[PDB]
Amino acid sequence: VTQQVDSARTMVIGHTGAQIFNSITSNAVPEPDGSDSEKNLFVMLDTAIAALKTPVEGNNVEKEKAAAAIDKTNRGLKNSLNNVLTVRAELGTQLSELSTLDSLGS
């Protein structure tokens, strides 16, 4: 949602949730197999949750399979953290601008 808060400056006054939890910055870690990088936080979290609740005692093909799912989750979490940090930074700039602009107005 956009809004104009001055004679010329127009600003984004709230980031739709998909931007926060369902995207990647333009520099995310690529998958080592080149397939594609998972890009929803909850998808990867639930993938990992399912993986952990799976018995693997002595059963190869489940042991390593779960381990690979966990690795993919690790990368995904890293990318998600970077994305949300980018959003934080943009909001910080918005706040600084708003503070500066109102003093000008007064």
Binding site: Q3, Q4, V5, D6, S7, M11, I13, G14, H15, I20, L41, L45, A48, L52, P55, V56, E57, A67, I70, T73, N74, L77, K78, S80, L81, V84, L85, V87, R88, L91, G92, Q94, L95, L98, L101, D102, G105
Partner: protein, 53 residues
């Protein structure tokens, strides 16, 4: 007219400030949550845990 226009922009800035500040608070909490989540995965990496663990 000019002073009224300044008043308009003042109102706008008030509301935008409130919304963006709230967003910042929640996103900070989200960041801490994601940090601890990542931490747990690191623990899961240990390959000597038994299935109950």
């Amino acid at each position: 007219q000019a002073q009224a226009q300044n008043s308009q922009y003042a109102l706008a800035r008030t509301f935008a400030t409130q919304k963006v500040s709230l967003e910042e608070s929640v996103l900070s909490q989200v960041t801490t949550a994601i940090q601890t989540a990542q931490e747990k995965i690191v623990y899961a990496g240990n390959g000597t845990l038994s299935d109950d663990d």
